[PDB]
Design a protein around this ligand. Structure first.
Ligand SMILES: CCCCCCCCCC[N+](C)(C)[O-]
Ligand SMILES: CCCCCCCCCC[N+](C)(C)[O-]
Ligand SMILES: [Ca+2]
Ligand SMILES: [Ca+2]
Length: 448
């Protein structure tokens, strides 16, 4: 029970578009007009106001600052979001401070203001609007599709994968910023987003808890050549866990219930200006990562999660290549990972915290509990940690340690050695603290 439209063609309401386990009711997309898809063009020439372009009137493009010479970034929002002044436009601007390029924000606000179930269908339209606009950068200005990068959030991610599929995977890259779960997880690839929709698909997963009984709006399913899982991808730091601004029904609700879903475009937008800020590490599971595994960055380097992911040598050597890492709690959310070993010393057996600080070069870190437990002489005790900022080179630690069981002597403990290390490369820095002062000191171990 299909319906056709302008140059965009037809939309069959039957499987897998509807009457799926994933999409139980049968509906059809709105009209192009009803959706009001709008391509807004930013280029280094005009980094503030945009140029309304249209694939319907080629004149609007040719007479615009669009540069057939350069890459083109598309940024598509999702359910109940907008292009005009929300984050997508904000994101285009950031992209133009670092590369000379065309960045378009795909605003379909009015169509994404529908009821989720409908919205899940309007997405098909915007796919086509977009795909179509690309089919006419090729025909009109011989603009190679493999120069196009589509970046979509939530429903937008699937939107982008849609356009991508309309162009037989000719499009060079689509990036999925926490692709929506409801109606997509475990569905035909025809309807969702999968590695086949572009030459390169990379995904950031920030809200991959189960949508049902549980409300994790993000897909847990791997759908890219690369699927990144910041902080394990289920609970992002800075957020406390779990549309018409619910904030007018229940004050705080929106933010509360969407914060993790949104960290996907947060992290990405910051990677644009901070490439070295989000290095993913390959691993089987986040726990292996969290339990001091898969460290440090591998042979060639860690992929940069985010904007500069397309620089990874083996970016498409496989599908569902998964990586893990930890972001910051706020600001630009950049964290760097270091390994920290401590082998014990002394005579008497104690119990306690095993804190640490860092001076590096740039600033100084925070306290860093590397261990709590039994402190038997000359053993060893490592733990990987996350430095929410860019320091430099260690060789300037501090130590400190506190009590858990109160007495059995009060021994002269210290720390024989403290193997430091970077994640990026492998730069150890390790130190000798010959002089095992008892308790609660800033015994500054130093180079050797
Ligand atoms: C799978 C549906 C995702 C629901 C999340 C909706 C988030 C609202 C968009 C955020 N905001 C309008 C502030 O950009
Ligand atoms: C306690 C401060 C954080 C706000 C918590 C708001 C949670 C309300 C959940 C929204 N809902 C419509 C399900 O009530
Ligand atoms: Ca697909
Ligand atoms: Ca790039």
């Amino acid at each position: 029970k299909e319906v056709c439209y302008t140059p965009l063609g037809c939309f069959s309401d039957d499987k897998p578009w509807a009457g799926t386990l994933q999409r139980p009711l049968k509906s059809l997309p709105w009209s192009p007009e009803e959706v009001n898809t709008r391509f807004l063009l930013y280029t280094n020439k005009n980094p503030d106001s945009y140029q309304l372009i249209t694939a319907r009137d080629v004149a609007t493009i040719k007479s615009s600052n669009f540069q057939s010479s350069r890459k083109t970034h598309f940024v598509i929002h999702g359910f109940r979001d907008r292009g005009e002044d929300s984050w997508p436009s904000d994101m285009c601007k950031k992209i133009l401070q670092v590369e000379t390029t065309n960045c378009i924000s795909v605003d379909w606000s009015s169509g994404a203001k529908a009821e989720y179930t409908q919205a899940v269908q309007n997405i098909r339209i915007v796919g086509a609007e977009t795909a179509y606009l690309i089919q006419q950068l090729l025909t009109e200005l011989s603009y190679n599709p493999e120069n196009v990068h589509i970046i979509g959030h939530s429903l937008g991610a699937h939107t982008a994968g849609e356009a991508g599929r309309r162009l037989e995977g000719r499009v060079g890259r689509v990036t999925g910023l926490d692709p929506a779960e409801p109606c997509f997880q475990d569905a035909s690839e025809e309807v969702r987003l999968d590695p086949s929709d572009a030459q390169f698909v990379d995904v950031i997963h920030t809200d991959a808890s189960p949508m049902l009984p549980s409300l994790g709006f993000g897909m847990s399913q791997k759908v890219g050549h690369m699927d990144f899982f910041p902080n394990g991808g289920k609970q992002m730091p800075g957020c406390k866990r779990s549309f018409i601004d619910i904030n007018g029904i229940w004050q705080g609700a929106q933010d509360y219930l969407a914060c993790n879903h949104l960290k996907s475009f947060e992290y990405y937008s910051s990677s644009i200006l901070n490439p070295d800020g989000f290095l993913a590490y390959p691993c089987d599971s986040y726990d292996k990562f969290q339990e001091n595994g898969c460290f440090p960055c591998p042979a060639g380097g860690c992929p940069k999660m985010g904007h500069y992911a397309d620089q990874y040598k083996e970016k498409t050597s496989a599908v569902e290549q998964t990586f893990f890492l930890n972001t910051g709690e706020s600001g630009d959310y950049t964290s760097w990972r270091y390994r920290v070993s401590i082998t014990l010393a002394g005579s008497g057996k104690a119990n306690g915290y095993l804190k640490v600080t860092l001076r590096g070069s740039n600033g100084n870190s925070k306290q860093y509990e590397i261990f709590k437990g039994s402190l038997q002489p000359d053993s060893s005790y490592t733990l990987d940690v996350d430095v929410n900022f860019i320091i430099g080179k260690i060789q300037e630690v501090k130590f400190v340690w506190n009590k858990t069981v109160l007495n059995l002597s009060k021994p002269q403990l210290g720390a024989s050695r403290i193997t430091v290390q970077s994640g990026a490369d492998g730069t150890e820095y390790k130190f000798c603290g010959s002089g095992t002062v008892q308790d609660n000191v800033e015994q500054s171990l130093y180079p050797c």
